Design an enzyme around this catalytic site. Sequence first.
Site, short mmCIF file in Angstrom:
data_model
loop_
_atom_site.label_atom_id
_atom_site.label_comp_id
_atom_site.label_asym_id
_atom_site.label_seq_id
_atom_site.Cartn_x
_atom_site.Cartn_y
_atom_site.Cartn_z
N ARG D 89 65.56 55.03 40.08
CA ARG D 89 67.34 55.44 39.76
C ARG D 89 67.87 54.61 39.42
O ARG D 89 69.14 53.99 38.67
CB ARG D 89 67.37 56.51 40.25
N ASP D 149 71.04 71.47 28.95
CA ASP D 149 70.33 72.51 29.37
C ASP D 149 70.73 73.99 29.35
O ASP D 149 69.97 75.00 29.81
CB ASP D 149 70.49 71.81 30.59
N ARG D 152 68.71 75.25 26.50
CA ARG D 152 66.86 75.41 27.42
C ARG D 152 66.80 77.02 27.91
O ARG D 152 66.66 77.32 28.08
CB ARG D 152 66.36 73.53 27.87
N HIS D 176 73.12 66.73 34.71
CA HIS D 176 72.51 66.69 33.58
C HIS D 176 71.16 66.09 34.24
O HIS D 176 71.40 65.00 34.12
CB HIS D 176 72.50 65.79 32.18
N1 LIG Z 1 70.32 65.41 27.32
C1 LIG Z 1 69.93 64.15 27.64
O1 LIG Z 1 71.69 63.03 27.24
C2 LIG Z 1 68.78 62.70 26.50
C3 LIG Z 1 67.32 63.76 25.79
C4 LIG Z 1 66.72 62.65 26.17
C5 LIG Z 1 67.36 61.14 25.99
N2 LIG Z 1 68.38 60.62 26.86
C6 LIG Z 1 68.47 59.30 26.96
O2 LIG Z 1 68.03 58.45 25.56
C7 LIG Z 1 68.42 57.40 26.02
C8 LIG Z 1 67.57 56.56 24.29
O3 LIG Z 1 66.39 57.10 24.73
P1 LIG Z 1 65.07 57.41 23.58
O4 LIG Z 1 63.77 57.88 23.69
O5 LIG Z 1 65.61 57.58 22.22
O6 LIG Z 1 64.76 55.91 23.55
P2 LIG Z 1 64.14 54.56 22.59
O7 LIG Z 1 63.72 53.10 23.65
O8 LIG Z 1 63.42 55.51 21.23
O9 LIG Z 1 65.56 53.96 22.26
C9 LIG Z 1 66.67 52.91 22.95
C10 LIG Z 1 67.03 52.31 21.24
O10 LIG Z 1 68.08 51.49 22.25
C11 LIG Z 1 67.95 50.52 21.42
N3 LIG Z 1 69.23 48.93 22.50
C12 LIG Z 1 68.66 49.16 23.55
N4 LIG Z 1 69.49 48.21 24.04
C13 LIG Z 1 70.66 48.08 23.05
C14 LIG Z 1 71.31 47.27 22.93
N5 LIG Z 1 72.14 46.79 23.73
N6 LIG Z 1 72.35 47.38 21.32
C15 LIG Z 1 71.71 48.50 20.84
N7 LIG Z 1 70.78 48.82 20.53
C16 LIG Z 1 70.14 49.01 22.31
C17 LIG Z 1 66.39 49.46 21.18
O11 LIG Z 1 66.40 49.12 20.54
C18 LIG Z 1 65.65 51.48 21.16
O12 LIG Z 1 65.94 51.20 19.74
C19 LIG Z 1 67.51 56.92 26.98
O13 LIG Z 1 67.75 56.80 28.00
C20 LIG Z 1 66.62 58.97 27.39
O14 LIG Z 1 66.31 58.69 28.72
C21 LIG Z 1 68.76 61.44 27.18
#
Ligand SMILES: NC(=O)c1ccc[n+]([C@@H]2O[C@H](COP(=O)([O-])OP(=O)(O)OC[C@H]3O[C@@H](n4cnc5c(N)ncnc54)[C@H](O)[C@@H]3O)[C@@H](O)[C@H]2O)c1
Lengths: 307, 307, 310, 310
Positions: D89, D149, D152, D176
């Site tokens: 984490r 959440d 859900r 969250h």
């Molecule tokens: N409810 C929520 O808040 C929730 C739910 C699902 C996922 N998430 C979070 O959302 C985030 C994205 O998940 P994902 O599945 O879309 O990931 P993903 O790997 O598919 O996409 C991440 C994107 O970020 C881009 N990236 C990384 N560093 C960057 C930077 N410096 N500048 C511009 N772009 C950059 C990458 O190129 C990639 O396209 C993760 O932290 C995930 O845990 C949050």
Amino acid sequence: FKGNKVVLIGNGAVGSSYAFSLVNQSIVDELVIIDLDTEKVRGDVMDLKHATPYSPTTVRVKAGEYSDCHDADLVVICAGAAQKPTRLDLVSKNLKIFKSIVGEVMASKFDGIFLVATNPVDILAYATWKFSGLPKERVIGSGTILDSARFRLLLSEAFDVAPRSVDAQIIGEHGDTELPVWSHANIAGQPLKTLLEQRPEGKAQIEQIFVQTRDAAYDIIQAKGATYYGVAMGLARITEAIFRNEDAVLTVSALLEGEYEEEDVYIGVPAVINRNGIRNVVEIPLNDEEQSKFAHSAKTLKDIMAE
Amino acid sequence: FKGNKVVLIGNGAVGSSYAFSLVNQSIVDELVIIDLDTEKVRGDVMDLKHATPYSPTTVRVKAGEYSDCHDADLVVICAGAAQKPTRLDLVSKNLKIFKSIVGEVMASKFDGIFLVATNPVDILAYATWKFSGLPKERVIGSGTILDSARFRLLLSEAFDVAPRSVDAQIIGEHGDTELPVWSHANIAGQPLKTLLEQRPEGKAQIEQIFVQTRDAAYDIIQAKGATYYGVAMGLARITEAIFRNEDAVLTVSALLEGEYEEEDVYIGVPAVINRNGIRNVVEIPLNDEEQSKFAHSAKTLKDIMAE
Amino acid sequence: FKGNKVVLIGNGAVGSSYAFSLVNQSIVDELVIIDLDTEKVRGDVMDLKHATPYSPTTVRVKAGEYSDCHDADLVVICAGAAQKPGETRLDLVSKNLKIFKSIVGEVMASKFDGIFLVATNPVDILAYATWKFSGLPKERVIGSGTILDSARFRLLLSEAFDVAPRSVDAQIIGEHGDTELPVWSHANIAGQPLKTLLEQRPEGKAQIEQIFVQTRDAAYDIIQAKGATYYGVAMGLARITEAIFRNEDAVLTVSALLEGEYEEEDVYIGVPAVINRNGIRNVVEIPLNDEEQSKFAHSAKTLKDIMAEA
Amino acid sequence: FKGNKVVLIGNGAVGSSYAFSLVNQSIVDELVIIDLDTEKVRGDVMDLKHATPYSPTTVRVKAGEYSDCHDADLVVICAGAAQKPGETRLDLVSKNLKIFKSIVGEVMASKFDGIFLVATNPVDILAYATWKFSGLPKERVIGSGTILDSARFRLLLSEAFDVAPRSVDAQIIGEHGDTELPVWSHANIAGQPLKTLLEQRPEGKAQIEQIFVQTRDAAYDIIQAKGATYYGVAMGLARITEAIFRNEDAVLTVSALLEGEYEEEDVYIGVPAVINRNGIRNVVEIPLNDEEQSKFAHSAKTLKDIMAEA
Ligand SMILES: NC(=O)c1ccc[n+]([C@@H]2O[C@H](COP(=O)([O-])OP(=O)(O)OC[C@H]3O[C@@H](n4cnc5c(N)ncnc54)[C@H](O)[C@@H]3O)[C@@H](O)[C@H]2O)c1
Ligand SMILES: NC(=O)c1ccc[n+]([C@@H]2O[C@H](COP(=O)([O-])OP(=O)(O)OC[C@H]3O[C@@H](n4cnc5c(N)ncnc54)[C@H](O)[C@@H]3O)[C@@H](O)[C@H]2O)c1
Ligand SMILES: NC(=O)c1ccc[n+]([C@@H]2O[C@H](COP(=O)([O-])OP(=O)(O)OC[C@H]3O[C@@H](n4cnc5c(N)ncnc54)[C@H](O)[C@@H]3O)[C@@H](O)[C@H]2O)c1
Ligand SMILES: NC(=O)c1ccc[n+]([C@@H]2O[C@H](COP(=O)([O-])OP(=O)(O)OC[C@H]3O[C@@H](n4cnc5c(N)ncnc54)[C@H](O)[C@@H]3O)[C@@H](O)[C@H]2O)c1
């Protein structure tokens, strides 16, 4: 970080129906209503407010005063009792009403867009542009927004298709000298006038479709005394194009400065509408008949304005 | 593979406003309008049709006759002139109107759902259920759909939030014996009555919020002579729940057969609404004050029906 | 008094994106998802259900089996792995015909009696196959066809002319593929003749060509960039679904069976058609100029030739 | 008289799904997409543009750079690869803080003066970081928080009680994450006390637990099935975006800065808050029962402890 605010001035049949359209459509989140008849405003505002909990998104409705225009984005004018069964008497009355209204609005510090519905709409849009001193982009008359929808409606019936699938336009004055743009009216490229020509008494059908478009207001007034739903919906459609910044082409009353070889007149034409109002007039090809009628319509308007 | 068809019977202020709501919302694709006043129908149908090219999706509007109900899905009754400034005289007049209307509708082979708006709505919903012979699920009165929205509207003003964020209900008769369900009224769990109690003269505020809910129609009528926008919107909301098969909980006038310890009466309660009409009445906990008022309201209705 | 029920068969990039479009749009209140990959389905159905409390009106999503089609109103088929680079056209058709015979067979065995909408490529071929396999009237079997090509052409024109795409009336017809054609004889913005306007620009002939090349080769360009296309087709599938469930009588370019229209028969191909709750009410036969006539006939021939080879 | 402009930074599963939700919903008329992976952006922007002719009203999509944020109204950050199994984490926080310092820095350097909405996990931590990095008022920095959440929990209750999710009023608050909590003291359908009703069912205590466990562990369950979650969060991000651009004063559960509310300060955490065109107008402080008070305080402590460790 202000929300979107419309001030309606004139809460009669047309204005109140427009207000209800806005409550149904949630185009904007704030609607202020101004009218000399403060009791009708009070009752309509309460009735309208009671619909808002079912609006798609929040709409706040309130009775207002001119100072409420200071930060309004759009001011919609539907004020002036309808013409009683002379044209110049009407024009004179309504021009005085508009000089007063536009002056009070501008005094509030209003710096948005005007949308005018009051008849004669092309004349009163021109008057609003002159009285307000605003750029032409920011003063719009409903113009043929409604005539075009009527034309499409009647064509949708003649050809049995969704009105949204009928591309057809009425241009010119909102009134007696308007004209159908048959050189362009089509369904997915089907040439509507040409198809009608081939029907039995198809020439009569072509005439009737336009006659019923041109005389629709009279027909509705003869039946129930006023029209309001068609105009309210057209006003809401223009309102949508502005607040959703659409760059949508709609037939509205716009100032010409050289387009269609005309100057110094508001008249119904296709124009691109977006958050800044009328971005530009679209100059479409017209056939000889259309060119003749459009020039005559513009002349008619400029003559009325001289008188 | 039929589309969705609504037949409106009664095209006065309420019916015509409901028709316009349907043109704005595109809940259904076909709307037929029936009224004794065929000239008002003719004029309204034309005016309404002219708005339809701007409807989100196709809406067809036409003037109709009773045979047009044969394959209608929903019949909405807003017929009967409003009460002129006795209750039993009104009930007698409107019951005769309903015996005629429902009989003509059933004769067409109609086998859909009724939604009744005409006052006294709980009495006339009950009458429609009896006259039609249909299952209770398929006969709905608008009931407190509008009273609840008024209550939420006034609470949204008192607490300065979106009305969609106010969960609050009025139940009982649509009229003098209705009651607020303060034991449940909340914004995201904020106990509204408890919060108001703590304001200065908060007891007066609590009373005023309900008084203004209860007497809203009178207040609107005193100002502009009729109410129509709030009811039209409530009718459209119920229409939406049916055609979009929502299983949405709405306060409407529904037949009780044991719920709330009442039988053989239509009255305003939360109920789950879906494409089959009222799926079930929702039986919520009421506090002692609410239990007392609701029982009295049901008694009032059953007494009116005996007379 | 049943609600509106869609069964999606094939929950890959295209199908899942279509499902999400339905959750955003609330066109129907019930969506059932079927796929061989039951883990992807379980995961997608949960993820999609969690969006539904914010849908405009109730949408119920569930993982399904063929028996769930018994009272389905619309079955949307997006099943079949996309064509692999180097895999022959005839090999792809052979494999997808097998998949469709199986899918359509299991659907009809459920006593389904609704409408099919097909997206799987080659869409005109597989729409024709669904029509033949199902035994249903032609009105009730629809291929997505050029619903997407038309939107692409309109998008590119909206950029060229700087207006709302909704204000551009323009169409692609023919095969959803290499043999499609732009209908420049009708493409217009409020009556503005777009090809004529483009011709007047410097190197305007080049611009006209590029607008069409970019339309025709859009899927290739998107696949080269990110490996698959899905949002454009999901949105087009949603648009057809809306026309059906809202009974619109909307004119849309979809793959429809021709029985004499455009002087062609016994072929599904992309054409404007009126869509309503019963499916394709009728094909709209529009005037085509000589170049359009030539290309449309060639496209129809190409499709009939491919089907003869299969 | 400018239109409504959103800049999305991070075009992975979550961001691209959010972009598609905007194309379906027409909340705003301009969407700019920024990502290090410029090929994915180019491919997604084309695919999304091709859906826009069927959007309810005009939506313009383009590939962007930081300078495009100058007149953006909302910047949505979904950037950062999801946490890898076995990655600690504190390691994830460290890496994402670095990413955010960079992103937020480049955004502010453009002269951006709008609202931030953050989705990247850990969302409460990164929302707080965005607030600190940007220098903006707390009203203008929002984390998605428990928007998802809450949906859900409402979805699972809508199944338990067989009604529209829109008729279920129920909320999750807190982090969250593992320390979130159900607000059973208020969860109701039109006044029906849901926990009390469940308790009366056979093994009802078990049902109450399962409804919450399935809410808390939803992301895990979806990831195990299909590798990532995206539709639920995209839809929640779209819901917040709607509240802002339509100026709704809607109460939504989002991650907001507390300065005394719930007797907590100096922490972003999931709470009901009024959302309008200026962002978070105010946090709504609702009555919590003893169990809810205990869990909420613990959740706030947990978040403050994680930030102290970073
Ligand atoms: N409810 C929520 O808040 C929730 C739910 C699902 C996922 N998430 C979070 O959302 C985030 C994205 O998940 P994902 O599945 O879309 O990931 P993903 O790997 O598919 O996409 C991440 C994107 O970020 C881009 N990236 C990384 N560093 C960057 C930077 N410096 N500048 C511009 N772009 C950059 C990458 O190129 C990639 O396209 C993760 O932290 C995930 O845990 C949050
Ligand atoms: N398509 C169109 O452009 C179209 C269609 C229908 C009607 N109209 C026109 O719209 C106008 C209104 O029609 P209506 O049927 O609503 O009329 P109406 O009589 O019902 O309402 C006119 C309202 O204007 C108010 N008013 C008059 N002077 C005012 C002032 N100085 N300040 C504020 N309010 C003032 C009156 O009190 C009244 O409430 C007429 O000019 C009518 O011909 C235009
Ligand atoms: N929330 C509510 O339930 C609510 C709210 C407002 C009004 N109302 C009620 O709605 C009803 C209508 O109100 P309004 O203001 O529209 O009245 P209105 O006078 O404007 O219209 C009544 C219409 O009913 C028609 N009609 C009468 N008998 C008919 C018959 N036998 N067949 C077909 N049409 C017939 C009349 O011609 C007239 O057009 C009244 O009972 C009113 O009290 C209910
Ligand atoms: N405009 C268009 O018509 C258009 C646009 C893009 C893609 N496509 C086509 O759509 C199809 C799907 O593309 P994709 O990218 O979503 O592919 P994909 O590989 O992501 O998904 C295909 C899905 O089909 C399922 N499947 C295969 N056989 C099945 C069967 N017998 N029963 C049930 N499910 C089965 C697979 O398990 C997989 O989940 C391809 O043919 C592609 O070329 C069409």
